[PDB]
Design a protein around this ligand. Structure first.
Ligand SMILES: O=[N+]([O-])c1ccc2c(ccn2[C@H]2C[C@H](O)[C@@H](COP(=O)(O)OP(=O)(O)OP(=O)(O)O)O2)c1
Ligand SMILES: O=[N+]([O-])c1ccc2c(ccn2[C@H]2C[C@H](O)[C@@H](COP(=O)(O)OP(=O)(O)OP(=O)(O)O)O2)c1
Length: 848
DNA sequence: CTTATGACAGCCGCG
DNA sequence: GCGGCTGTCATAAG
């Protein structure tokens, strides 16, 4: 079969590559690769090579890679463009693999591992690695085996060997419930000391060296730990053998609160599964712990255990190991579902990049564009440095805070790529400039037509509509491929078909990101602004077009139909369209959902396309790619007192949705956005009730809402203390910690954290509050034994019995209810023009 | 990343 | 004792 790369690395004048050969064998080669870069030349010099601007270029072959780099520096000094691909690994891959790469994952060693490190003094810092590794579970995808490394004697105790037999049994039988599917795939290896285990693991590693190395938190915990441990114990010469090319680099990552270290294992591609998940799941999760994610994904989670993990090895080593196995298998189970690694393998081979560069839209697009330009002898521009400079972005209408009985929303598809394509925005496409009228003038087609020669954007930009721009071409090609591969979604292969289609979608949605990123070879401020400013007029123009149409239809005049617009959406108030027929004519809920759907399809969408073809002519664009789809139809169930929907402000609304782009729901479902019910900081029991409140407001009406309040409020004190405790994340605890006490500016949760410490001071048993970790918070009644307004303890857990009974006694229900339930509700009912209790004076609603 | 809201913390000005 | 305000910190959804 066809050859394919595995990992590629540049070291000095060499390029080191692991690859699969003609006969499926994994192997390594060192190549003294000669790069070509390109300079500009006079018309005199005749060449096949031109830059994107059609300017002639000379191909400079270099004897070695350092030459090429030294040349880029020399060229930088003179002040002349050094164009071509500066990242020689990409160039090497483009040269070596000059075809559509077809890979076979059965020949790619994917490893999932986790370690366990008994640490009795807090989280074992990986860069310090000061505690013995007492378990490694390492899964090899080729052998389909779980290789379990068990330390039997540590500083923290001696233990019996782990039992597969006991592991297989049910929890009720004293078992660990390690699944049947993996019980015959475990290879158990106990060790008498830690050096014996680490050197046996290190051999194992050379024998079965990961191409893709993954798992949950490997890049931040497991890899740094193993590395520093081996390193500290055996010296760096030994730890480096953990890379196939024996080169490793320590890298520091700065962030919000501080910096961090990762080990770059040259010749391996590390795809931490936590990072694959956060990147490609597209579901903002309240927690990213393997336990929570595995629960959300598989309805099962990580193995359960009594007491702290720090005592588990001593207390129940049997479980401790089994828990190490289950956690590695959890990741595998999630990947069996979401397919992220396969999706990474697809993208990486499609772009011809190092697989790990799937985390970089920059690196991916750059390599994709470079290749297609290479195929036509074109020379990519030098990556110039650019001052990071904020430009305007998405437009968001101020909603008038109200209730909205019938709402119908619409959506522009793939707005930003669409605009790039519609206008022809690209570096080499810039054709000039035009005198900008205020954006409002363009919105109302009142400004003078920008140009009738060039494709225009309301930010003053003008583009050639005669040339086919590099970027719009590349984004058009990815669109066309999507269709193609989602056309084989008519025909085992309904797998490679999905991942191709999903990955084209990922590239499409990631392009604008890159184009706004200053380290993009094709970044251009004038252009990025052109995209966002065009989008800003697209949306408001169509807000105008929609109002005009519906006013004309309804015989109304100057009636605000479009109630809200967020980035690529418009939400349309369909009250009057309903009134045209009249409510009593509809027989059931489904009958008016029928009516609206029909009206949008037959009357609005034609008026919308009609409206956008006008904009296209006004701006003089290359082609018309502005297409809207009807998203939601929302309202109260027929013959009910329910309000249907409400907006409390920008990105703050609830809708009672009946139909999402064609799909008609059985029961109605609440689309809630921005409101406290969608907030992780909101207590469990309260999240549940605000949602009930919103359910009752939209579907049932005021008297129902009021009934639930009076009831929930009567019944608050009996709810579990953990369910009514608000969550928060603790950051810079020390930064506000002045001798155990809240210094200037100390935020509410951190104050609570210190109050806990004050009651914790001098306790081992007590679970300490980790800096950068989620914390429960609870208000305390005035004059309490902890001497503060609040207390805050670690989340996901019950509070220590050393203070628990005094917390429960002193916690301020009144201040808790008002702060977490009532105030947010008053929020919603105020907007929806509703009362959550009777006899509320009408006069509150005024600024008297 | 940016667009945007909310919980709180001092600060200010007020007989 | 407190509303109007600028600021830090949290979280949301593209
Ligand atoms: O488009 N391609 O398919 C393509 C384009 C360029 C390619 C290759 C394969 C190599 N190169 C480039 C990269 C090198 O700098 C130069 C010569 O490549 P080579 O493999 O012929 O190396 P030589 O130095 O000639 O030695 P070799 O012939 O023994 O490998 O040409 C393939
Ligand atoms: O988005 N921009 O970056 C932007 C947008 C508009 C811009 C400029 C710079 C000028 N304009 C406006 C204001 C000018 O009156 C008009 C004409 O553009 P131009 O480039 O023709 O400017 P001139 O100085 O007239 O150039 P010329 O006399 O060489 O044609 O375009 C830049």
């Amino acid at each position: 079969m066809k050859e394919f790369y595995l990992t590629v690395e540049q070291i000095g004048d060499s390029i080191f590559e692991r690859y699969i050969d003609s006969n499926g064998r994994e192997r390594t080669r060192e190549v003294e690769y000669k790069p070509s870069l390109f300079a500009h030349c006079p018309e005199s010099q005749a060449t096949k090579y031109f830059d994107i601007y059609g300017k002639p270029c000379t191909r400079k072959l270099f004897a070695n890679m350092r030459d090429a780099s030294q040349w880029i520096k020399r060229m930088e000094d003179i002040g002349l463009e050094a164009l071509g691909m500066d990242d020689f690994k990409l160039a090497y891959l483009s040269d070596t693999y000059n075809y559509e790469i077809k890979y076979d994952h059965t020949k790619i060693r994917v490893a999932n591992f986790d370690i366990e490190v008994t640490s009795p003094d807090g989280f074992p810092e990986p860069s310090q690695a000061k505690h013995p590794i007492d378990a490694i579970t390492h899964y090899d995808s080729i052998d389909d085996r779980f290789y379990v490394f068990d330390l039997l004697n540590s500083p923290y105790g001696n233990v019996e060997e782990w039992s597969i037999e006991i592991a297989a049994k049910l929890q009720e039988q004293g078992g660990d419930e390690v699944p049947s599917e993996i019980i015959d795939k475990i290879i158990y290896m106990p060790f008498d000391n830690e050096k014996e285990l680490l050197m046996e693991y290190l051999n194992f590693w050379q024998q079965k060296t990961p191409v893709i190395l993954t798992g949950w938190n490997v890049e931040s915990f497991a890899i740094p730990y193993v590395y520093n441990r081996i390193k500290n114990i055996f010296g760096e010469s030994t730890a480096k053998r953990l890379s196939p090319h024996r080169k490793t680099r320590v890298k520091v990552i700065e962030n919000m609160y501080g910096s961090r270290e990762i080990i770059t294992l040259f010749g391996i591609s590390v795809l931490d599964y936590i990072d694959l998940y956060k990147k490609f799941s597209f579901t903002n999760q309240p927690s990213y712990s393997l336990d929570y994610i595995s629960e959300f994904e598989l309805n099962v989670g990580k193995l359960k255990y009594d007491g702290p993990i720090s005592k588990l090895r001593e207390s129940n080593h049997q479980r401790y190991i089994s828990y190490n196995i289950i956690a590695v298998y959890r990741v595998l189970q999630i990947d069996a579902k979401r397919q992220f690694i396969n999706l990474s393998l697809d993208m990486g081979y499609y772009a011809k990049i190092q697989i790990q560069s799937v985390f970089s839209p920059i690196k991916t697009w750059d390599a994709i564009i470079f290749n297609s330009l290479k195929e036509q002898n074109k020379v990519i521009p030098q990556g110039r440095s650019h001052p990071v400079q904020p430009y305007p972005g998405a437009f968001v209408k101020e909603p008038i805070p109200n209730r909205y009985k019938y709402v119908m929303s619409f959506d522009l598809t793939s707005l930003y790529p669409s605009i790039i394509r519609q206008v022809n925005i690209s570096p080499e496409t810039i054709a000039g400039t035009f005198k900008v009228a205020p954006l409002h003038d363009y919105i109302n087609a009142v400004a003078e037509r920008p140009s009738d020669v060039y494709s225009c954007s309301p930010n003053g930009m003008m583009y050639y509509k005669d040339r086919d721009g590099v970027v719009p071409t590349e984004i058009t090609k990815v669109f066309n491929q999507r269709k193609e591969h989602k056309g084989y979604m008519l025909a085992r292969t309904e797998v490679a078909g999905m991942t191709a289609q999903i990955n084209r979608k990922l590239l499409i949605n990631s392009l604008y990101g890159a184009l706004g990123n200053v380290w993009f070879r094709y970044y251009d401020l004038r252009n990025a602004t052109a995209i966002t400013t065009f989008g800003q007029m697209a949306l408001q123009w169509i807000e105008r077009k929609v109002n005009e149409y519906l006013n004309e239809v309804c015989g109304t005049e100057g009636e605000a139909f479009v109630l809200y617009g967020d980035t690529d959406s418009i939400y349309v108030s369909a009250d009057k369209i309903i009134d045209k027929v009249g409510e009593s004519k509809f027989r059931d809920t489904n009958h008016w959902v029928d009516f609206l759907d029909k009206f949008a399809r037959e009357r609005m969408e034609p008026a919308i396309d009609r409206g956008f073809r006008e904009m296209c002519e006004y701006m003089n664009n290359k082609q018309h790619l502005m297409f809207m789809d009807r998203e939601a139809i929302a309202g109260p169930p027929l013959g009910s007192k329910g309000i249907g929907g409400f907006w409390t402000g920008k990105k703050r609304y609830a809708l009672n949705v009946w139909d999402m782009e064609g799909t008609r729901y059985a029961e109605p479902k609440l689309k809630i956005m921005g409101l406290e019910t969608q907030k992780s900081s909101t207590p469990k029991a309260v999240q549940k009730a605000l949602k009930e409140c919103i359910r009752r407001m939209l579907q049932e009406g005021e008297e129902s809402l009021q009934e639930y309040f009076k009831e929930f409020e009567k019944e608050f004190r009996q709810l579990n203390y953990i369910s009514i405790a608000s969550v928060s994340s603790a950051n810079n605890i020390a930064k506000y910690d002045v001798g155990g006490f809240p210094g200037p500016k100390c935020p509410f949760h951190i104050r609570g954290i210190l109050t806990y410490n004050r009651a914790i001071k001098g306790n081992i048993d007590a679970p300490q509050v980790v800096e950068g970790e989620k914390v429960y918070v609870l208000p305390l009644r005035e004059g309490n034994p902890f001497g503060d307004k609040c207390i805050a303890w670690p989340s996901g857990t019950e509070i220590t019995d050393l203070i628990k009974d005094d917390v429960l006694h002193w916690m301020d229900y009144t201040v808790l209810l008002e702060k977490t339930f009532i105030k947010p509700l008053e929020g919603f009912t105020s907007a929806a023009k509703l009362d959550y209790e009777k006899k509320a004076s009408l006069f509150d609603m005024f600024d008297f």
